[PDB]
Amino acid sequence: RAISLP
Amino acid sequence: RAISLP
Amino acid sequence: MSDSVNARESNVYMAKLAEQAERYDEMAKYMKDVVEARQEELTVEERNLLSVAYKNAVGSRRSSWRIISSVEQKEHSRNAEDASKMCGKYRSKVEAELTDICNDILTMLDKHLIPTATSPDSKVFYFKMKGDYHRYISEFSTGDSKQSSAEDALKAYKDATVVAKDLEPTHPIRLGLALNFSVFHYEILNEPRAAIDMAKEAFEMAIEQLDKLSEDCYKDSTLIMQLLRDNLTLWTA
Amino acid sequence: SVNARESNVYMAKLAEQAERYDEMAKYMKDVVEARQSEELTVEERNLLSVAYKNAVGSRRSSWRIISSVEQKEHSRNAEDASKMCGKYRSKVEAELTDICNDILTMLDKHLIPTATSPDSKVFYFKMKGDYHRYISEFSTGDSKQSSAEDALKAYKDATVVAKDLEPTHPIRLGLALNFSVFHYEILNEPRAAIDMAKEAFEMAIEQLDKLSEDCYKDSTLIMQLLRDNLTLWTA
């Protein structure tokens, strides 16, 4: 659920 | 651009 | 045939999973294997899965076709002939995919689904689905090919119309038939008056009897009545 | 001579607009393998990344959806259906393995060896860590250990070079973002993730003032994802 680099 | 049945 | 009941329940499960996974080509194939392996009628659930599957499979290719054609034209308009021709070749590739997918579902319709349809409900559904897939082909065909697929679509929608006369004017299947059939007149045949006349007639006919809208339907039926108005509004400017 | 390059690049852009990314990736793949030792442009480099990111992205998203249903079934003691989900997940894994191996080969053989500037080296070292990480997401046993170790090394290698970029440089921040994610999700080392992201963010904040109008939003976009992860991670 953590965002990585778009 | 007219909509047909979803 | 106990092995046949399970194989069907299994493909339905996989069709539903492929949908959740958003892998629609494989969704289509699961539902196709349900069709090709049956005894002489799909249920409402399956019929709907089949339609959603093909609709999305073809939908993403339709959307790509439109974007590529647009770029092809901006190029032509810019005298950038090389680029255009490339865009052109790329558009063909997508056309070849469309052709295969529409022909896949039309073959199933022609040989399997239309012939075993009992109810007026499912007869309309499948005739309509057939004009739609010929319409999708007509969208990118030109000259003689467009004419021939436009004629197959016209006939399918008429056939659906004849049977639809047995459904209430408020029936969602009948209303959806009129929406697509009028879209077909407008976009494919370039007959704006027949389109506007057909959508108007279906909207007015439904509205003559809003009091007869059943509680099980008034949602989908109003939705469709609303798309009919939206199209009228657009075509009317 | 370089006619094919201009043309693959045109097609890659065209496929992106059409949203046909496996094809976008194959166009950009053909740019990479052709190059005589010439470096990819910033524009090309980004297109290669966008293409692979999307090609892999869609399989990752399906992978997660399919797994969740698998564990839903497993927990409802529907075993027959659980196995079906599993066979389908494996098939998506086969696709993930192919696409990740493809880009990683290009990075090992072509991209990382030819890169000059601090920018490029960090950029490509980060990509390698990312794709090893994607393999690590679904792998098991020794595959997992292996790809975990190559991602770690790639991010370390990228970290080493990144020290030559300003703490607010978007490429330096993005590395810390993904490097910290790697630590938390794959290595299951929440402390080292939190620290890494905290450090990257604090080091940037200490310097937001020493930036210009037309440059600070690229930085804040990413410092923002860093805070959002910290917020999630800290009880």
Numbering used by the authors:
A (entry chain Y), B (entry chain X): 1002 to 1007
C (entry chain A): 21 to 60, 63 to 259
D (entry chain B): 24 to 59, 61 to 259
Paper quotes:
One protein family common to humans, C. parvum and in fact all eukaryotes is the group of tyrosine 3-monooxygenase/tryptophan 5-monooxygenase activation proteins (YWHA), also known as 14-3-3 proteins. All 14-3-3 proteins are dimers, with each subunit comprised of nine α-helices framing a peptide-binding cleft. The dimer is shaped like the letter “W” from one angle, with an un-partitioned bicameral pocket where a substrate protein is held at two typically phosphorylated sites in the two component clefts. The parasite Cryptosporidium parvum has three 14-3-3 proteins: Cp14ε, Cp14a and Cp14b, with only Cp14ε similar to human 14-3-3 proteins in sequence, peptide-binding properties and structure.
